[PDB]
Amino acid sequence: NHLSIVTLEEAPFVIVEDIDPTETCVRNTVPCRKFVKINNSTNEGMNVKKCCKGFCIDILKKLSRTVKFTYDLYLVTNGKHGKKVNNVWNGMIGEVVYQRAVMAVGSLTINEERSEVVDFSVPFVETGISVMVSRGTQVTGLSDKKFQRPHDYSPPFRFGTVPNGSTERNIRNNYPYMHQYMTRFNQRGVEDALVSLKTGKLDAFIYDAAVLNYKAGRDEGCKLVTIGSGYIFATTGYGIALQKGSPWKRQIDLALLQFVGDGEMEELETLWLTGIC
Amino acid sequence: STRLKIVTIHQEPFVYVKPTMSDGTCKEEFTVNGDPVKKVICTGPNSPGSPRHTVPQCCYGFCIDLLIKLARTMNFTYEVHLVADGKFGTQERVSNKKEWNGMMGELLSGQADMIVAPLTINNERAQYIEFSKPFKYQGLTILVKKGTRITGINDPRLRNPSDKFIYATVKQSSVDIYFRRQVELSTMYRHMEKHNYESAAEAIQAVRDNKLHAFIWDSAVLEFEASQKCDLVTTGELFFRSGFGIGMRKDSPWKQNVSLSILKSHENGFMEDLDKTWVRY
Ligand SMILES: N[C@@H](CCC(=O)O)C(=O)O
Numbered sequence: 112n113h114l115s116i117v118t119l120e121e122a123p124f125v126i127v128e129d130i131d132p133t134e135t136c137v138r139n140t141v142p143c144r145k146f147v148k149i150n151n152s153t154n155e156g157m158n159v160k161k162c163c164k165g166f167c168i169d170i171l172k173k174l175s176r177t178v179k180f181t182y183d184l185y186l187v188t189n190g191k192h193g194k195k196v197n198n199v200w201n202g203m204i205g206e207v208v209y210q211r212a213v214m215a216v217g218s219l220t221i222n223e224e225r226s227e228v229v230d231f232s233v234p235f236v237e238t239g240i241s242v243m244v245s246r247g248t249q250v251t252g253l254s255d256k257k258f259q260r261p262h263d264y265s266p267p268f269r270f271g272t273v274p275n276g277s278t279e280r281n282i283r284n285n286y287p288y289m290h291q292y293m294t295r296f297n298q299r300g301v302e303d304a305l306v307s308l309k310t311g312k313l314d315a316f317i318y319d320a321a322v323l324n325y326k327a328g329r330d331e332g333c334k335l336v337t338i339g340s341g342y343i344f345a346t347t348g349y350g351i352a353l354q355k356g357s358p359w360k361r362q363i364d365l366a367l368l369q370f371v372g373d374g375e376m377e378e379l380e381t382l383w384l385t386g387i388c
Numbered sequence: 389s390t391r392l393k394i395v396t397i398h399q400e401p402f403v404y405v406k407p408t409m410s411d412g413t414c415k416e417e418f419t420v421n422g423d424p425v426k427k428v429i430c431t432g433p434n435s436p437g438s439p440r441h442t443v444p445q446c447c448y449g450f451c452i453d454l455l456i457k458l459a460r461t462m463n464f465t466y467e468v469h470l471v472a473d474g475k476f477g478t479q480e481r482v483s484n485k486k487e488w489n490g491m492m493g494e495l496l497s498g499q500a501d502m503i504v505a506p507l508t509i510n511n512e513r514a515q516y517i518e519f520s521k522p523f524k525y526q527g528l529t530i531l532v533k534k535g536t537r538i539t540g541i542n543d544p545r546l547r548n549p550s551d552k553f554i555y556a557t558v559k560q561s562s563v564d565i566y567f568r569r570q571v572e573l574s575t576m577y578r579h580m581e582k583h584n585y586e587s588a589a590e591a592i593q594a595v596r597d598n599k600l601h602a603f604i605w606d607s608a609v610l611e612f613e614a615s616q617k618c619d620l621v622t623t624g625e626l627f628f629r630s631g632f633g634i635g636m637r638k639d640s641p642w643k644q645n646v647s648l649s650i651l652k653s654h655e656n657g658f659m660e661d662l663d664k665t666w667v668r669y
Contacts, residue, residue, distance in 0.1 A: 221521065223651040233509065237525050237629065239654075281655055345654045346525045368511035371630070373570065 114182045114359075116171065117203050117212040118143065119191055121301075123325060123383045124167040124218040124236075124349070127186065136162035141172065143184040161186070166383040167349075170235060170367075171216050173375065174351075177366045178359065185212075192219055194275045204229060207352045214359065215352035220277035220319065222347060230355050233364050234348020235376065240278050241320040242270075242338045243308065243327065250315060253286070253344050258315075261292050270315035271296030273304065278318055281345055293317075301326065308335055321349070321384075328386015336388075392466040392642075394455060395491050395500035396430065397476060399588060401612050401666045402451040402506045405430070405470065414446035420669045426456055432470025436586065440472055450666040454523060455504045457658065458634075461649045462642065469500075474587060475560035476505070479512060490560055492517065495635055502642070503635030506606060508562035510630070512569075518638050520647045522631025523659065526608040528563060529622045530555075533595055538602060541627040546602070549579040555602035556583035556591060563604055566628065580604075595620060608632070612667055 120127040128140065136142050143163035148156045163184060175182060193204025200208045203215035207229045220238060221231045244250060250257060257268040272278050274297050283290045296313060298304035301322060307313035316323070320343045327337050351367075353360050370376045398405040409415055414427040430447035433440035447468055459466055477490025487493065492513055494500040509519045532538060538545055545553040557563040557580055564584065567577040583600070585591035592613055594600035603610070607626055614620045634650070636643050653659045 221651065223648055223655060226521075226648060226651060231521075233514075233519075234522065234631070285656065344660070345657075346522075346659070347651070347654055348522075348525075365511055365514060368509070368514055372511050372566065374572070377628075 112180055114180050114213040115211065116182045116184050117187050117206040117215050118163065118167065118184060118217045119187050119203055121218040121322065122165065124165050124321075125163060125216075126165045126168075128162045128164070130160050130162050134160060138164075139169075140164040141168055141184060143186055145186040146188050158185075166236070166379055167216050167218065169379050169383070170370075173370060174363060174366055177369070178362045180359075190275070192217070192276050193225060194280075195224065200228060204352060207354055210354060213354065213357070214363075217349075218319065218322065219349055219352055220347060221350040222277050222280070224280070225277075225352070228355070229352040230357055230360050231350035231352055232360065233367050234350050235367050235371070236321050236349040237343070237346065238319055238321040238349055239343030239346045240281060240317060241323045241341065241343055243305075243316045243318065243323045243335055244314065244338055245308065246334055246336045248314065248338070250338050252339055252342060253282075253317070258289050259286060261289065267292075268314050269296055269312070270317060271298050271304070271313060272317045273298050273300060276319070282317070305330075305335065325384055325386065328384075328388050330388060333388035392459075392464050393499065393501045394466045394468045394504050395471050395494045396447065396451060396468060396503070396505045397471050397474065397491060399506050399609060401449055402609075403447055403449045405432075406446045408444055408446055412444060414448075419665050421665060423665075426453060428452055428455075428468050430468040430470055433472060433474075442469075442472075445470070450662050451504050451506065453662055453665070454653075457653065458504075458646060458649055462645050464642070466502075468504075472499075473560075476507060476558070476562060477513070478560045478562075478565055479516075480560075488516065491635070495637060501636070501640075502646075505635075506608065506632045507635050508606070508630050509633045510562055510565060512565055513562075513635070516638075518636045518640060518643045519633035520636075520643070521650050522633050523650050523653070524608055524632040525629070526606055526631065527626035527629040528566075528604060529607040529610050529625055529627065531592065531595055531603040531605065531610045531613065531620055532601065532623050533598060534619050534621050536601060536621075536623070538623055540624050546576055549575065553601050554579075554583050554599075555604060556580050556585055556594075556600055557604045558588050558591060559584045559586055562630070563606075592620070608667065615668075 118125050140162035143161050144158045145161055146156045147159045187203050190201030193202035204225050206212040207215050261267045271293050304316040308316055323337050396403050417425045425448050427446050427448040429444050431442050431444055433442055471491045475490030477488055477492025479486050479488050488496055491503045495503050567573045591603045595603050610622050614622050634646050
């Protein structure tokens with residue numbers, strides 16, 4: 112009844128803050144710990160007490176109340192969302208596969224290869240792959256020739272993603288030439304990519320739909336938009352990842368569907384995901 | 389060993405239902421993109437409270453293509469029939485006993501092994517059956533006659549209703565469940581309870597005929613209807629979000645592979661191709 116739960120920072124779904132130097136988390140935040148190494152010549156480290164908040168953290172609070180469990184939340188340090196590397200899962204997915212966490216909560220995209228190794232709750236945030244550009248860029252979608260056959264254009268279109276997540280996995284599987292072209296434009300994170308778009312070093316950024324819709328909603332001047340009036344390729348959702356055969360899945364699924372049906376979910380969307388644009 | 393019993397429901401563009409030809413086969417036709425239409429023979433009834441005469445018919449559409457893909461993927465055979473009472477399915481009190489009607493009841497009673505239809509995933513049904521991951525993400529909207537101006541779900545002619553402006557959904561559907569369970573909607577629910585229609589087609593025709601001023605229903609269906617019939621528009625817009633899923637009994641041996649196949653189809657472009665063929669042209 113006391114559960115190990117892993118998460119990963121990605122605003123606005125999970126936002127990480129320093130604790131009051133009270134050592135207590137206050138307001139709408141919950142304790143979360145991070146393993147921080149002492150140095151790079153030892154395996155020693157310290158757990159650092161942090162405070163976590165956000166859309167997904169509000170979901171976890173409701174599930175904990177409804178399904179009736181308590182938890183110790185921690186931030187993943189081995190990878191990010193989850194990638195299979197030499198047949199071994201890392202990230203939040205790996206923490207669940209290797210039974211270090213009972214569940215993984217965050218901006219965790221449901222796809223087929225992850226579903227082979229963890230159970231996923233019903234989706235609670237719609238997502239997919241979207242494309243962010245400067246307003247007025249004419250790009251039909253991922254199937255645009257500028258993406259699929261980029262050296263047919265002079266100069267070629269400059270577009271990239273953040274590697275190692277569900278979006279790069281999808282592109283690698285679907286568009287081999289596009290994938291090998293775009294790795295030159297790999298972005299270290301969403302913030303770097305938005306700076307690159309705004310200063311004209313990148314023409315398009317391909318990434319998780321829910322995060323890009325959030326960023327477009329808060330862009331200074333509403334200059335960056337997602338293409339196709341917020342079009343999504345490979346529609347899916349974020350889901351709570353559980354161990355295969357977990358005895359919590361049924362209740363967690365029923366509770367998430369209850370939050371959707373009774374209005375609790377649209378409240379969190381208004382609270383966390385609105386934007387001015 | 390057994391063929392899967394698949395239950396479905398008439399609901400364009402997901403399931404078209406047409407008579408067989410005189411010889412009992414389905415007429416050959418082609419899609420908007422030139423490919424042959426895959427059709428399956430589906431049995432079902434041709435008015436509430438009357439006897440139901442089951443006859444072979446032709447079925448095709450987004451959901452029938454999805455069924456054919458699942459069948460080929462997972463290597464099962466099947467026979468398709470149309471739900472006998474024509475409803476999607478709700479749980480009604482009878483007495484303190486309860487029963488499910490519609491496709492939900494056929495699945496729970498064993499008359500069906502799988503529901504392959506635009507069947508909304510919700511808490512009430514998920515207590516009793518297993519849903520796949522969604523094969524379509526959509527929501528609820530409002531269909532009206534072109535020129536009718538209402539703002540959406542919060543328009544005072546819906547929230548403060550009278551007989552001057554009539555609105556409705558489909559009986560024994562997920563929209564019926566939604567309005568009945570949310571106390572904040574009880575004013576709308578009591579108005580609709582007097583006007584709900586037996587099927588979406590009948591309600592849509594009533595909007596065209598100016599006998600129904602607004603029809604509250606699945607956006608995946610309503611936006612298709614508005615794309616085909618120019619006297620109809622949706623008015624805005626997705627005021628609630630939900631998805632359609634394949635329905636199976638909780639002890640189904642197919643349930644894991646059905647969900648994996650749904651996910652693979654979203655990821656490799658198969659689900660978009662179906663959208664291009666049936667929904668968005
Ligand atoms: N939500 C994605 C991360 C970002 C992306 O690759 O689009 C995942 O779970 O991997």
